[PDB]
């Protein structure tokens with residue numbers, strides 16, 4: 672499963688008919704149709720850098736995974752009454768700077784998107800139990816706007832030379848991904864899904880209002896990762912964003 676025309680977004684509904692469901696992600700957030708909700712609390716993140724574990728090339732992307740044996744690293748607040756435990760962050764990007772984000776805001780496409788993913792450890796005991804539950808996962812999405820280089824990306828970008836090809840992995844430790852979030856944590860929230868197979872409708876999205884920057888050359892570092900395994904012809908990972916999906920009557924709520 673990937674993003675090419677035969678294993679990609681258009682092919683997913685064959686094995687995952689939930690691809691055409693009613694809570695699919697990402698979406699285009701229309702700011703004139705949001706609803707400002709006052710039961711929403713501020714998002715609170717508290718991540719312990721000792722939980723960073725490893726960085727992995729998974730062929731269509733790369734992931735930074737975290738130890739999630741306990742609640743050292745948690746997300747609270749916002750729409751949640753439960754604590755969600757951090758387990759991973761990753762990015763999505765596009766083939767050129769003029770698209771690549773997953774979420775869009777009033778039709779505007781950004782160059783990339785950061786996802787910081789968490790599972791509900793108040794209700795469930797593992798990521799695998801939580802992944803399929805409506806209340807199982809919480810993902811912070813941060814739109815990344817091409818512009819000045821972002822120095823907070825540097826440990827991540829420096830690490831990619833160790834995981835160039837599909838399946839490579841390396842320790843990635845002592846890193847707090849709250850350093851990647853924007854200074855404002857004003858947000859939109861809506862009930863949705865994983866944006867890749869198995870596309871479970873188990874994600875409460877937290878989309879930050881403020882973007883963070885990325886340069887054109889930092890973007891090119893993500894696109895130079897390779898989707899092939901070591902020794903095969905190099906096939907760069909040019910893109911890995913899913914198109915936006917119909918809202919199907921859901922409401923996007925605004926914290927602000």
Ligand SMILES: NS(=O)(=O)c1c(F)c(F)c(S(=O)(=O)CCO)c(NC2CCCCCCC2)c1F
Nearest residue numbers: 729732786788798802810864865866867868869
């Ligand atoms: N954008 S996202 O947050 O919905 C997302 C992906 F796009 C994605 F591609 C992945 S993947 O690389 O691991 C491919 C299949 O999952 C995960 N990973 C999680 C998805 C949750 C299902 C069970 C494992 C939890 C990892 C994932 F969370």
Ligand SMILES: [Zn+2]
Nearest residue numbers: 761763786866
């Ligand atoms: Zn993602």
